Design an enzyme around this catalytic site. Structure first.
Site, mmCIF file in Angstrom:
data_model
loop_
_atom_site.group_PDB
_atom_site.id
_atom_site.type_symbol
_atom_site.label_atom_id
_atom_site.label_comp_id
_atom_site.label_asym_id
_atom_site.label_seq_id
_atom_site.Cartn_x
_atom_site.Cartn_y
_atom_site.Cartn_z
ATOM 1 N N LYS A 135 -7.984 6.767 -1.170
ATOM 2 C CA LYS A 135 -6.707 6.417 -1.785
ATOM 3 C C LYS A 135 -6.387 4.943 -1.589
ATOM 4 O O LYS A 135 -5.857 4.288 -2.493
ATOM 5 C CB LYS A 135 -5.595 7.287 -1.203
ATOM 6 C CG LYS A 135 -4.316 7.286 -2.015
ATOM 7 C CD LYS A 135 -3.272 8.185 -1.379
ATOM 8 C CE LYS A 135 -3.826 9.576 -1.124
ATOM 9 N NZ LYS A 135 -2.784 10.499 -0.598
ATOM 10 N N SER B 127 11.551 -11.924 5.831
ATOM 11 C CA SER B 127 11.929 -11.170 4.646
ATOM 12 C C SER B 127 11.397 -11.875 3.405
ATOM 13 O O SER B 127 11.462 -13.101 3.295
ATOM 14 C CB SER B 127 13.447 -11.021 4.564
ATOM 15 O OG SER B 127 14.075 -12.278 4.395
ATOM 16 N N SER C 11 3.792 0.790 2.304
ATOM 17 C CA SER C 11 3.520 0.664 3.732
ATOM 18 C C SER C 11 2.655 -0.557 4.018
ATOM 19 O O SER C 11 2.860 -1.256 5.017
ATOM 20 C CB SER C 11 2.850 1.934 4.256
ATOM 21 O OG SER C 11 1.588 2.131 3.645
ATOM 22 N N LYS D 122 -6.522 9.739 10.355
ATOM 23 C CA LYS D 122 -5.563 10.833 10.398
ATOM 24 C C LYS D 122 -5.444 11.364 11.818
ATOM 25 O O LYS D 122 -6.450 11.547 12.510
ATOM 26 C CB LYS D 122 -5.959 11.971 9.448
ATOM 27 C CG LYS D 122 -4.819 12.927 9.121
ATOM 28 C CD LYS D 122 -3.731 12.230 8.320
ATOM 29 C CE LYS D 122 -2.401 12.966 8.408
ATOM 30 N NZ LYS D 122 -2.445 14.318 7.795
#
Lengths: 494, 494, 494
Positions: free
Chosen positions: C109, C388, C376, C121
């Protein structure tokens, strides 16, 4: 035949129940006011599992060119002890359960002989015979790099140990790989891996040590009057008759040292064949015959043994490099008074129960095969110290001995020396040779014998405490479990 | 009554003036051609202050839930020595001056007994009684993490030490916290904190050591003929009469060892009450009476003492766990020939001056209470070595002894053995028990006694050098200041 | 119904065969002179397995007090990419195969959307409902410490990702645990873990992002004329009718954005019930009804749907938070023109084959659910930059825009401004609001849309290249496999 791993799990459970029945009675009861049965059960449940297991699937390139993956399992049982020791094995059909159970066995073996090390095990699913030396070297280097990037191999965490499959060349490769991957900046990086060659800081006499340990262990139980009386035979310091199964290095050293101690080897048992003699077999002549011929059969002044070596009327029977050769049916048939395990799991628990029924002593393998572990620990300490043992103290000790002898000389001449001259300054020929021949190997031998004697004494005390008259294996397991319980219990838990 | 801290500052100034008056005369004069008075004064001014003091205001959560801040002060006196030792104290009303003066005292105490450690002290403003065990554990963990993030706690920099307030469980917590916060990767991380329990590598006999040190220190001054003659009493190896104030662990061990040495304890003084006997008090019976009853009063075959224990006509008086019980008025009234300080600052400097006037020996507390520091240093070394002391050498030494005895046997049989057989191979029963009972505790005891003897000899030599006939405290302070001066002066300054 | 893991393995094999049939033809053929079929097969075999899997058995203490072990599995698929991303899941019945297959899916992905991250994972075998919040926090802290000591969690190696089970509070705990265990010394330690709260440097609009991604993905396939013509429907920019299964957050955001784009939601399907309307359902009114009532049934001006939502005559059907609801039997029955997967494995491969037979487009889930991964990754980059986005450039850009408008003003007054005054300086009301309302969220939205558009274009190009007319899932898998092949092939292998 159950696997060795269910064997180890059952041994741990059997020892755990007994030690739990005792801890809650004497010290854990005053440790905390509330109920302690659950507290001790929780500690035991924490102790049982292996903390870390990791699987590596790393690529390698064959000499012809295949680009195929290799699977390797590393198991660290626990980090209660920070430095762990773990043997490395290159064998087909290894499993994660393989390394878990072997790590648990290794940490218990380190516990029984008071060696401050945790248990670990590395297993690589490969056949060393199929692959060439260069391919094996590349596999070792890749495995070491992958294990180092994950922070397992290292002096602080885990030290590799040589299994029967792995030679010292593999460990020279592993040390070079660790030096390249992490760096030689640290002083302790020299002590990263044990089993090194002598020029690299390797301990002397490592090969004999395991066999030597056996020679000590049996001795520590022969000298005991209570156990020998319970068995019903006189203590056989020199009149004992022993036979050995297989012709491993441990068995060879054991039989040589037993012959030096005065014991006689009436017969030698091996898978290829068995050799029988009325009185004994010369260790040196048999060793030469085996190195040249390759088989013990046909030994001069010897007749091959017909039948089963296990059933022979020997005082001591030593299985070496053997796995479940003595079965449930074998135990009633054998008449050997003492069975001393030189290998892992030579006998089944049912055979152990039969031996307990027939009052045949079994000496636990866990206590016997720890000589190699102890000597590896000594070598690790030597690598940390970076000094050969006793280098700065040999001449000091011999000067002190000579000064003491001269002082005795002068005192005797002062008191009884009115007529003639007294000469106590001369040392014993054996003592003089020992002084001239002093080296680190003597210190290693002394340390190994001292550790084995202490371990035997603690095992006997534990067996007396828990009323295990002849089940020495359970006593050793209980002792190891008690030691591990203590370290964990008083160590803070986050 | 002035604070202990002005006491320490005045002691340092008094020693500094005397040592400055001497250094410029002998070695500093040839050290540099220019004027050296200012140079030595500058070195002393650099030596005096504590280099680092840090204050932590860290939050904690109570069991009920309060979210309140805790203030903790850490003082490292200097880094001339890289590894420092610092005791940790959990007491209400601690100050930054508290830890500064205690760090200076600790570094001087390490200096007098030639222990290579700097001085440090940690003080947490809290009442341990009010807070539960879990809250105390959380406070210790938070304090350790905050101190570690600032790079103070660690084997290289600073090693915690157990004060009377802190138990070994707190230090197990501190070790776990350090292992979690920084990591167990380093080998030396095992030696991060002293005072560990035995299973964790802790030294044996640590609890008795301080008291044991006292028993040695007094001995090292009893054996001296010059000081005993100056006092005017015969050396009391076995006929000395001693009394002790309080019933601390140090006092208990001291009186037990004195009774074993042959001394007699005519009376025992304690805050709750005092017990008087015409000849002596049995240490074991008194210990049992105290452990059961909780008070020494009512001891069988004993009459409670009426009056002041300090004024008793004892040869030796040992204040333990005491702070300024012997005041200026007390000093003329007491008739004890020797005052041996088992605690910090039991007497005032005015009382010291009075003692000098009346020729009553005072043995400095700095030399006496260093046994615990020495044993903690030994335990740190053991943790670094990762080996129990003498493990590899016990059997070697006993084999050498047996070989020497056999050599004497053979020589005697050669010379005087024409008729009969001589048997010198048999060892002394005490010697045989010592050989069989050899352990690390014997080595620790030998090292502690050797260090105490050396420190006493150096203190006596310093006192003779500077013409301090009876002011042993000033002599010890001058010796410590001279040692620190030397390390700093000849070490390069950036 | 086969497991998702055999599904992933079969997808990888199917893509691998196709890409292997092509690589040896065009570039690998010139890459090396010798045979390349075996070389590419070897590369694929190296790519397939997960490199590292580790199992932790760590103790925890319950609130009542149980001292029981927790098993947690961490799988890192490969290190071809050094920074990896790995979601953390707290669910009962997790397996090592669980995390291996999920890590492989995650790395693919990341590959499809050109995000430079490896796959990982973490799965913890526990039931979050049974344990209290404090127990869950302790489990997270213990797991994080154990994982950090083994050198897995960290900005350089592996960054945790929030699964549906884990909230952001768990990741605040994980960040605190990492800061305590390893230290905040490094600048990059701030970017250790993604999913942080906004005050901690967390990205804005993260919750909507995944749903937003869906709204973009379908759009990128609606705009394409070729695929829409092949399906046989006109491109439905505003006249498309779509229905959604479930009421997840992704589904909610998707339907809101589709309604804003002009699409109409004729019906909403959920496990509890289904709601049907002739024209459409208001996203805001339905959201309020769901938040208050808790069920979509009973919506004002709506009639509950009777039957199966999958079989409805909608233009687009979006399964969300669904696992194999559309089976082999379902595929012929459904008449939806487009099936857009908002969850993992909503349909079976047999149903995919049936869809290919009936020419019903399936849009692969791998491309759709990557919006959260992309956002993410953006948040990780923001944490690394510590700024920012657009903070230093917003006023600069708006000043440049105003200057351009004023320049156009002056030029128009110079040329056509002889009579009257021209006013182009005024911006569009929407443009003026955007200038005044400029923030980092706009930049994140732009980046997400750009990444999704690029991924869709690459998927379409790959599908055209390999002649996959409608099997978009296979095209995406082939694209990911080709990218991974390239990185590994041209990167050096030790």
């Amino acid at each position: 035949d159950p696997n060795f791993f269910k064997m180890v799990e059952g041994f741990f459970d059997r020892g755990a129940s007994i030690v739990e029945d005792k801890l809650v009675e004497d010290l854990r009861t005053r440790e905390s006011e509330e109920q302690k049965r659950n507290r001790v059960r929780g500690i035991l449940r924490i102790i049982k599992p292996c903390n870390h297991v990791l699987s590596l699937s790393f690529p390698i390139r064959r000499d012809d060119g295949s680009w195929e993956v290799i699977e390797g399992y590393r198991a660290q049982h626990s980090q209660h002890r920070t430095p762990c020791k773990g043997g490395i094995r290159y064998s087909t059909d290894v499993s994660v359960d393989e390394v878990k159970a072997l790590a648990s066995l290794m940490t218990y073996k380190c516990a029984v002989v008071d060696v401050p090390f945790g248990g670990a095990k590395a297993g690589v699913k490969i056949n060393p015979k199929n692959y060439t030396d260069n391919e094996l070297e590349k596999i070792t280097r890749r495995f070491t790099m992958e294990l180092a990037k994950k922070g397992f191999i290292g002096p602080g965490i885990d030290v590799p140990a040589p299994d029967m499959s792995t030679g010292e060349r593999e460990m020279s490769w592993i040390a070079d790989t660790y030096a390249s991957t992490i760096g030689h900046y640290d002083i302790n990086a020299h002590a990263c891996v044990t089993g090194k060659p002598i020029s690299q800081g390797g301990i002397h006499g490592r090969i004999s040590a395991t066999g030597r340990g056996v020679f000590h262990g049996i001795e520590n139980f022969i000298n005991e009057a209570s156990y020998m009386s319970i068995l019903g035979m006189t203590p056989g310091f020199g009149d004992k008759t022993f036979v050995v199964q297989g012709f491993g290095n441990v068995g060879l050293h054991s039989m040589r040292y037993l012959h030096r101690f005065g014991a006689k080897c009436i017969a030698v048992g091996e898978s290829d064949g068995s050799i029988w003699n009325p009185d004994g077999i010369d260790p040196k002549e048999l060793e030469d015959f085996k190195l040249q011929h390759g088989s013990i059969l046909g030994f001069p002044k010897a007749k091959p043994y017909e039948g089963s070596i296990l059933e022979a009327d020997c005082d001591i029977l030593i299985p070496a490099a053997s796995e479940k050769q003595l079965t449930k049916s074998n135990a009633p048939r054998v008449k050997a008074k003492i069975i001393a395990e030189g290998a892992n799991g030579p006998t089944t628990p049912e055979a152990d129960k039969i031996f307990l029924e027939r009052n045949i002593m079994v000496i636990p393998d866990l206590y016997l095969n720890a000589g190699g572990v102890t000597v590896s620990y000594f070598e690790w300490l030597k690598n940390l110290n970076h000094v050969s043992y006793g280098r700065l103290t040999f001449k000091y000790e011999r000067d002190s001995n000579y000064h003491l002898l001269m002082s005795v000389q002068e005192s005797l001449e002062r008191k009884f020396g009115k007529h003639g001259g007294t000469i106590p300054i001369v040392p014993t020929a054996e003592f003089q040779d020992r002084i001239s021949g002093a080296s680190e190997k003597d210190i290693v031998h002394s340390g190994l014998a001292y550790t084995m004697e202490r371990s035997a004494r603690q095992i006997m005390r534990t067996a007396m405490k828990y009323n295990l008259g002849l089940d020495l294996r359970t006593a050793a397991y209980v002792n190891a479990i008690e030691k591990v319980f203590k370290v964990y219990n008083e160590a803070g838990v986050t």
